[PDB]
Ligand binder design. Structure first.
Ligand code: W7V
Length: 167
């Protein structure tokens, strides 16, 4: 049993809810919240900007030190950093950004990072300002992630379309 409430069950391991991931993280304090990161961990907008704002910029400060030591992530890659006030840990995952011309086949590689964690609160990778089709992102998620994933979808309209169209 876990703390996650109000989710629709899509599969054995994937759950979905219309929710603000920031507000969901603040309520649940999950072991892992996933960030929709870029390779530079520059948390300007989208999910990343919202998560970072909720940490009062402490996520960005920590991320800048990580990049100064390690250099950029790979598209499809990830790193584990603090969850600050939102979670124990934040798994920063880089999905391909279609608005930069990145290979959508890298979306599967991005979701494979989730398999290193038993339970996660996450957004749909490469959705929103990353430009991918969220229906596609949900299909890749279901077909790739084997651990237990609780997806937060900010937009109610999109949530209802993801559920209604789910095979
Ligand atoms: C990425 N990077 C580094 O690899 C070095 C460069 C000289 C100082 C340390 C480790 C860096 C970025 N900003 N500041 C440093």
């Amino acid at each position: 049993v876990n703390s996650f409430s109000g989710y629709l069950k899509l599969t054995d391991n994937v759950y979905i809810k219309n929710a603000d991931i920031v507000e969901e993280a603040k309520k649940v304090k999950p072991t892992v919240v996933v960030n929709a990161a870029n390779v530079y961990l520059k948390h300007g907008g989208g999910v990343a900007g919202a998560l970072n704002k909720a940490t009062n910029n402490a996520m960005q400060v920590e991320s800048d030190d990580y990049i100064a030591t390690n250099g950029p992530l790979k598209v499809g890659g990830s790193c584990v950093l603090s969850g600050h006030n939102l979670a124990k840990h934040c798994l920063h995952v880089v999905g391909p950004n279609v608005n930069k011309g990145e290979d959508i086949q890298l979306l599967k590689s991005a979701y494979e990072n989730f398999n290193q964690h038993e339970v996660l609160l996450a957004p749909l990778l490469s959705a929103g300002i990353f430009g991918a089709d969220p229906i596609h992102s949900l299909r890749v998620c279901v077909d790739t992630v084997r651990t237990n994933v609780y997806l937060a979808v900010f937009d109610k309209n999109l949530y209802d379309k993801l559920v209604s169209s789910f095979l």
